């Protein structure tokens, strides 16, 4: 049980430096555990980045560095880029075995940024087979926290909804975020009024996207 | 044009066991150990083991005795790994990858990976997704943009493909995370955003594809 940790979350902005940092539960990270570096980019996409410590691998940006740092082994990003957000691996030899950490999700900051919101009421086709989903788009947005509150006849809703959240765009850096309402092609038929409230940093009042079913 | 693709994946029952496969080109397979690692839904990279050109040497995890087998056929350019007594903690993307070693620089790397395999261990059926337009309106716009998109409700297990028009059209898309309703059964959400006056310019199909269960579904998106 050698166990590798590395810190788990780190924001920096465009052109700053960042440090990632590796360590070991047996001892002191050394030249002899051949520290490597992974990046993971959305779509399990995979780059070899460091080796054996400090050797940048062939076509690897100047940027990325490895060195040690104290007790554990180190990524450093010198003037971080918008397309830097990422995943990061560090692994360690450990004589036979290799070992990796648990990974640091690097996000990269921007200027706030809105969502703009969407709401879909469910098709018709879905509405044939007896149940009957909302969905709620927030697009584009920055910083990631949001948010949603469903409202059916103006009721708060509560235990009938899930959301998800795509990565970091390596582009323009936002966030979006697509959550859906769940209910039974009954109760759906049993009211008007469907409503997506968002609340977010770029927002100064709550934006509500509605629909009334049948118009 | 390194190229490393695998298969072998899908649905397995508990207990049982499962053959990957993972053919190469584009590189002098003889000479390079190969290496294999795994990734759990959520969860962080696991290495599983690794071999030498010649077979003589193969490095695992510490494991239980013959959990993974690795072996290798060079005739072939082909890398494989046997999995035996699965259980749901088996559940994962199986990554093929070539190991760049170097003994003079002291370098040992994992520079080029395959995309993945996926194995799910469960007993659960097998279902295919139900593919449901989400309808744009020239009335509903956002910031400039209108929105449409595809859910894909209800299907197990993981993954779903989808693309648009094809793999046409690219910009301005989101395929979202799947989440796992308390009904046992996943749910996803692929969006496409365009400039409102865009609208009525283009075709929009949503393509989605469910291995497992041999689903293949063309959705046209109509404004509505």
């Known amino acids: 049980e050698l166990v590798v940790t590395q810190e788990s979350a780190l924001t920096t902005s465009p052109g700053e430096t960042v440090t990632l940092t590796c360590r070991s539960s047996?001892?002191?990270?050394?030249?002899?555990?051949?520290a490597t570096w992974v990046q993971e980019k959305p779509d399990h996409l995979f780059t070899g980045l460091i080796g054996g410590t400090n050797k940048r691998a062939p076509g690897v940006p100047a940027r990325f560095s490895g060195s040690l740092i104290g007790d554990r082994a180190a990524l450093t990003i010198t003037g971080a880029q918008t397309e830097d957000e990422a995943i990061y691996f560090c692994a360690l030899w450990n004589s036979n075995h290799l070992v990796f950490g648990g990974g640091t999700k690097l996000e990269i900051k921007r200027t706030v940024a809105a969502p703009s919101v969407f709401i879909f009421p469910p098709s018709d086709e879905q509405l044939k087979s007896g149940t009957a989903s909302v969905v709620c788009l927030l697009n584009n947005f920055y910083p990631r926290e949001a948010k949603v509150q469903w409202k059916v006849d103006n009721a708060l809703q509560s235990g009938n909804s899930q959301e998800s959240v795509t990565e970091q765009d390596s582009k323009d850096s936002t966030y979006s975020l697509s959550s859906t309402l769940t209910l039974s092609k009954a109760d759906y038929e049993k009211h008007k009024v469907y409503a997506c409230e968002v609340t977010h940093q770029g927002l100064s009042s709550p934006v509500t996207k509605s629909f009334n079913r049948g118009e | 044009e390194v190229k490393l693709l695998e298969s072998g994946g899908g649905l397995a029952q508990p207990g049982g066991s499962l053959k990957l496969s993972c053919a190469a080109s584009?590189?002098?397979?003889?000479?390079?150990?190969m290496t294999w690692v795994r990734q759990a839904p959520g969860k962080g990279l696991e290495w599983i083991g690794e071999?030498?050109?010649?077979?003589?040497?193969?490095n695992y995890m510490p494991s239980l005795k013959d959990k993974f087998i690795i072996s290798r056929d060079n005739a072939k350019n082909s890398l494989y790994l046997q999995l035996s007594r699965l259980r749901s903690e088996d559940s994962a993307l199986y990554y093929c990858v070539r190991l760049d070693f170097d003994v003079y620089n002291h370098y040992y790397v994992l520079d080029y990976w395959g995309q993945g395999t996926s194995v799910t261990v469960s007993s659960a059926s097998t279902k295919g997704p139900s593919v449901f337009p989400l309808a744009p309106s020239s009335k509903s716009t956002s910031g400039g943009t209108a929105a449409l998109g595809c859910l894909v409700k209800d299907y197990f297990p993981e993954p779903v493909t989808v693309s648009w028009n094809s793999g046409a059209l690219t910009s301005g898309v989101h395929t979202f995370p799947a989440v796992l309703q308390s009904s046992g059964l996943y749910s996803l959400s692929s969006v496409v955003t365009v400039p409102s006056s865009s609208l009525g310019t283009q075709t929009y199909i949503c393509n989605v594809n469910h291995k497992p269960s041999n689903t293949k579904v063309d959705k046209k998106v109509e404004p509505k």
């Open positions: 584009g590189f002098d397979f003889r000479r390079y150990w």
């Open positions: 071999i030498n050109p010649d077979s003589r040497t193969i």
């Open positions: 047996s001892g002191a990270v050394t030249t002899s555990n051949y």
